[PDB]
Amino acid sequence: HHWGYGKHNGPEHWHKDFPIAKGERQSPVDIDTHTAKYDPSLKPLSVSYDQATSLRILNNGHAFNVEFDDSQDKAVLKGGPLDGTYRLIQFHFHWGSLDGQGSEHTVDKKKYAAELHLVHWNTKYGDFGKAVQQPDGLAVLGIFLKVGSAKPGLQKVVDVLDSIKTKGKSADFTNFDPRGLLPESLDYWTYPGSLTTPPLLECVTWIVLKEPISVSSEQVLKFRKLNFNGEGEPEELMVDNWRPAQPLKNRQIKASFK
Numbered sequence: 001h002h003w004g005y006g007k008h009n010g011p012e013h014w015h016k017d018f019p020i021a022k023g024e025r026q027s028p029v030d031i032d033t034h035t036a037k038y039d040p041s042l043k044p045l046s047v048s049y050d051q052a053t054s055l056r057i058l059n060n061g062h063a064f065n066v067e068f069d070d071s072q073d074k075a076v077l078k079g080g081p082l083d084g085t086y087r088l089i090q091f092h093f094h095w096g097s098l099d100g101q102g103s104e105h106t107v108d109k110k111k112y113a114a115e116l117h118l119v120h121w122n123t124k125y126g127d128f129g130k131a132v133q134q135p136d137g138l139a140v141l142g143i144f145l146k147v148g149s150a151k152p153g154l155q156k157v158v159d160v161l162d163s164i165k166t167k168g169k170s171a172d173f174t175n176f177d178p179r180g181l182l183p184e185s186l187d188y189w190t191y192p193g194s195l196t197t198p199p200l201l202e203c204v205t206w207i208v209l210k211e212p213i214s215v216s217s218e219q220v221l222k223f224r225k226l227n228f229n230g231e232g233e234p235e236e237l238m239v240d241n242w243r244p245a246q247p248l249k250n251r252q253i254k255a256s257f258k
C-alpha cells in the first residue's frame, strides 16, 4: 500500500516502488565533521524572510507542513552554494518517539530530537513541479532541534497541532514568521542530495546549519501526539517519521567554516 515509516512500508521497502532509493545522491547522510572540506569560496547564506506569508498548516499523513504563498519573491534564500533565487514553499519536521532520535541527518553519528526542513525551489524553473525535474531545482535548509529550553517562535506551531491531529486535516495559519526558528549563526555544511521521502527525487542542494535550536520537552511532546491515520481509523501515533542515513558514495560535504 502507500509508503510509510512502519515495519511493512518503511524506508527499507521504499526501493520497491521508487527504485531511485538506491541512487547515487540520496539523503539524508551522516556528516563526518573531520572529513568535510572547508571551502573558502562559499558565500554567506542570505535569508530574506521579512515578507513571508504563511497560509495553512496541514497534516498530510507523514508530517505536518506549514505552507507559504510562493507566487512571488516574498521569502527567499540566496548566497551560500546557490545560484539564483529560491522561494520558500513550505517547512516541516521529522522527529522521534524518544529525545535521542528524530533527525534525518546526523553529525558524527549523533542524532538530534528532530530536524526542521525549510523547502525552497529555484525560481528559474517557473513552478515547483518543474523545479523537481532538475538537479538544482530545490534547496532545503536543514536545522537540528535538541531538547532544552523552549523556543518562543515555535509555540504558535505547537498550539495549533490539536486542530490537525489526523491525516487530511488542515487549519488556516497566517502571519507566522519563520525567522523565529533560525539559530543565531548561519554557518553550514552543504552537499548535493535528494528528497528524504518518496519519490526521493535527486533535485536538492542541502544546506545543513551547524548550530541547532533548542526546544522544550513539552514542545516536542506535542509533535508526538499527532496521528498518521485519518479520522475514524485506528490510532497510529506520528513518531519516528525519519529516514536513516544513506551512503555518501561519490560526494563531498563542504563546510562554510573551519
Ligand SMILES: NS(=O)(=O)c1ccc(C(=O)NCc2c(F)cccc2F)cc1
Pocket (backbone or CB within 6 Å): 117, 119, 132, 140, 194, 195, 196, 197, 198, 199, 201
Ligand atoms: N523531507 S524533505 O526532503 O525536505 C522533502 C521536501 C519536500 C517534499 C515534497 O514537496 N513532496 C512533494 C512531491 C510529491 F508529493 C510527489 C512528487 C514530487 C514532489 F516534490 C518531500 C520531502
Ligand SMILES: [Hg+2]
Pocket (backbone or CB within 6 Å): 131, 132, 133, 134, 135, 136, 137, 201, 202, 203
Ligand atoms: Hg530532479
Ligand SMILES: [Zn+2]
Pocket (backbone or CB within 6 Å): 092, 093, 094, 117, 196
Ligand atoms: Zn523533510
